């Protein structure tokens, strides 16, 4: 069915608080914090804002199984300072 798709920056209640590490071999490792029920997308958009060198070349992957955009750390078990391997461009960023 058709519905709204608000993709803006906003704050919300505090559910959980886990840890994550974006180890980009094609760029650099970066640590960040997020809640249990939170759209990883919000993290992507923010990334570009800082280092918009490869927003269309981002792919979160873990040493166990692939990850999508409609997924969460709740049913992924990716907490406790879990470093999710991520790949990026080769001639666009800086590694």
92: Cβ–Cβ under 8 A, 6 or more apart, which residues?
53, 54, 57
The three-point CA angle 58-77-63 to 5° equals: 50
Number of domains in the chain: 1
CATH of the domain at 82: 3.10.20.90
Retrieve residue 66's tokens: 């692939």
Domain hosting 36: range is: 1-95
DSSP bridge pairs for 85: 61
| DSSP β-ladder status, 82-83 and 65-66 | unpaired
Q: Burial level of 53, CB count in 10 A (0-12/13-18/19+)?
A: middle
Rg (CA), the chain: 14
Contact present, 56 and 63 (Cβ < 8 Å): no
DSSP bridge pairs for 86: 24, 60
43: Cβ–Cβ under 8 A, 6 or more apart, which residues?
32, 34
Dihedral pair phi/psi, residue 24, rounded to 5°: -90, 100
DSSP string, 38-59: --THHHHHHHHHHHTT-STT-E
Can you tell me the distance from the alpha carbon of 26 to that of 30, in angstroms, rounded to the nearest whole number? 12
């Amino acid at each position: 069915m058709a519905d709204e798709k608000p993709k803006e920056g906003v704050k919300t209640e505090n559910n959980d608080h886990i840890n994550l590490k974006v180890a980009g071999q094609d760029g650099s490792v970066v640590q960040f914090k997020i809640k249990r029920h939170t759209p990883l997308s919000k993290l992507m958009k923010a990334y570009c804002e800082r280092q918009g060198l490869s927003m269309r070349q981002i792919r979160f992957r873990f040493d166990g199984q692939p990850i999508n955009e409609t997924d969460t750390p709740a049913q992924l078990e990716m907490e406790d300072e879990d470093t999710i391997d991520v790949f990026q461009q080769q001639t666009g960023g800086v590694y």
